[PDB]
């Protein structure tokens, strides 16, 4: 039902819009949480309210997309947001969407793509290893292919964890049997950082 | 002041069973619809269960994920919310939270639910053959790949502690499966390739287990 996008970043001080899709989410009730690394969420409190003076906290909730906006945005309000609503069976979330607040230039990741070894292969196994290091804000998508199908099972991602320069890094595995590994022309790991991708492509031949 | 405090949780073997309960102050909380909703670790929220208040008569309602083997009740004398988690998945392994209300206003600490067998297993250690590709000329990439172990942590050096330029070991991925994997690459000298030699020595304390993996060029 409900759709976040993955991530959003803002200039310290200006607005920042984080929606969330669902179809007829305008004749819902939309929730908000604002959950910072390590804490529990809490229940983002937020005006529907036209006009007055403007708010730090606001919602619009109209057809299909409800947004939260965020106004006078400072590193404080970094978190990941996540919606809700009521649904027929219980609640429905979100999959959640990271602030980030800039505090320095965006960084473009530095990708890293390993087939599977030899040694991995002759115990019945195969992975692949794509490491993600030196990008900001700390939030990227990894997708993978198999030749260009997209591929989802065996995928594990870590969560962006803040290097010693203040920069992020991310690393994500494709598990594969040595049958699977073989009978592709290619698997490539594909990363998005901020609207743009790199994608890195190996091949068992 | 709105409390909700959060118990129970600990490791558990998958097919085992569990009690959680919620301690909740500073509300009437006889006049409350109560939740328990989940986190997976590094995932989203996924609501699991909600009992609504003493005047609707507290039916219970639940997930499709955890229907028939979780029960959700409460002690409105003890003012405590509870929840029976039976025949427990892998896949339930996540932080339980207690959250107030159909408005969800109020939420605890949670607290965390393993679902694993608790089972030491030492790494396999594979080498990942130097690539120039993705790095700066005249250098070229190498690595170790430590994969399925439990429990943290492991420990990756380079030559015996001697080369530490360059050197980026991972956080490690916790899997599907309950296990572990890192892994750790080093920038070198693409002139150096097969005149060096290197070698990852990697320590899992917990199994006893130490590997010296040596990494060569394709």
């Known amino acids: 039902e409900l759709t976040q996008p993955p991530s959003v970043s803002v200039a310290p001080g200006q607005t920042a819009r984080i929606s969330c899709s669902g179809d007829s989410i305008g004749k819902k009730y939309a929730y908000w949480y604002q959950q910072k690394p390590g804490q529990a969420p809490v229940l983002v409190i937020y005006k529907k309210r036209p006009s007055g003076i403007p708010e730090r906290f606001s919602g619009s909730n109209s057809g299909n997309t409800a947004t939260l906006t965020i106004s006078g945005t400072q590193a404080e309000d970094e978190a990941d947001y996540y919606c809700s609503a009521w649904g027929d069976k219980g609640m429905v979330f979100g999959g959640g969407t990271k602030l980030t607040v800039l505090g320095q230039p965006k960084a473009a990741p530095s990708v890293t793509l390993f087939p599977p070894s030899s040694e991995e292969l002759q115990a019945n196994k195969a992975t692949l290893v794509c490491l993600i290091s030196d990008f900001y804000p700390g939030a990227v998508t990894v997708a993978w292919k198999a030749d260009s199908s997209p591929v989802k099972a065996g995928v594990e991602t870590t969560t962006p964890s803040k290097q010693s320069n203040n920069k992020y890094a991310a690393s994500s595995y494709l598990s594969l049997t040595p049958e699977q590994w073989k009978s592709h022309r290619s698997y490539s790991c594909q990363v998005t950082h901020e609207g743009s991708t790199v994608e890195k492509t190996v091949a068992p031949t | 002041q709105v409390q909700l405090v959060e118990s129970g949780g600990g490791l558990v073997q998958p097919g085992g069973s569990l009690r959680l309960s919620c301690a909740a102050s500073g509300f009437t909380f006889s006049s409350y619809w109560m939740n328990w909703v989940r986190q997976a670790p590094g995932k989203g929220l996924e609501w699991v269960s909600g009992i609504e208040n003493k005047y609707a008569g507290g039916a219970t309602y639940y997930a499709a994920s955890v229907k028939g083997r979780f029960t959700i009740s409460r002690d409105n004398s003890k003012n405590t919310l509870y929840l029976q988690m039976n025949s427990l998945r892998a896949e339930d392994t996540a932080v339980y939270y207690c959250?107030?209300?159909?408005?969800?206003?109020?939420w605890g600490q949670g607290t965390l639910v393993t679902v694993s067998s608790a089972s030491t297993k030492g790494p396999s250690v594979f080498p990942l053959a130097p690539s120039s590709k993705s790095t700066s000329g005249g250098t070229a990439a190498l690595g170790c790949l430590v994969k399925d172990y439990f429990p943290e942590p492991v420990t990756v050096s380079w030559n015996s502690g001697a080369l530490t330029s360059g050197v980026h070991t991972f956080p490690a991925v916790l899997q599907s499966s309950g296990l572990y994997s890192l892994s750790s690459v080093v920038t070198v000298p693409s002139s150096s390739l097969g005149t060096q030699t290197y070698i990852c020595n990697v320590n899992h304390k917990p199994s006893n287990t130490k590997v010296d993996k040596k990494v060569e060029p394709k």
């Open positions: 959250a107030r209300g159909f408005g969800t206003d109020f």
